[PDB]
Every structure is written in structure tokens, then in C-alpha cells.
Amino acid sequence: DDTLSIRADGDIARYEVLELADPPRLAVDLFGVGLATRAPRVKSGALRDVRVGAHADKVRLVLDVRGTM
């Protein structure tokens, strides 16, 4: 209730975090990562929900929110 913690364990990482609105979202981009089946352990950290993808970079994690953070 005080705060939800999202933990990503790996060798890296360079990251960037930013916000989006309509709907309110928090987005993290991780570099030096290729998307993998372990991405599902990500379900632990939603966020109304969490979606993850990649575009020949660079993985993007998107957290829809239930309240301003």
C-alpha cells in the first residue's frame, strides 16, 4: 500500500524511466536486453497491468497505473 516495488534482476542495465497519460502509465526502457520468456516474472509488478515488448533494441516495460506515482 505504501509503494509497489518492481525488481528486475540481470547483468545490466542502462535504463530510462518516463511517464505517459491517458491512461496514466510509467514506462521503463532497458538496454542490452533481448526479450525472453523470463519477462513473465514481470506479471508480479502490474500496475493495473504491465506489458513488455522490444523493437530490435531495447525492451520496453509499460505499467498502467491505478493512481498517480
UniProtKB/TrEMBL annotation:
Subcellular location: Cell outer membrane; Membrane
Regions that span the bilayer: none
Family: Belongs to the bacterial secretin family.
Protein name: PilQ
Range of the intact protein held here: 214 to 282 of 901
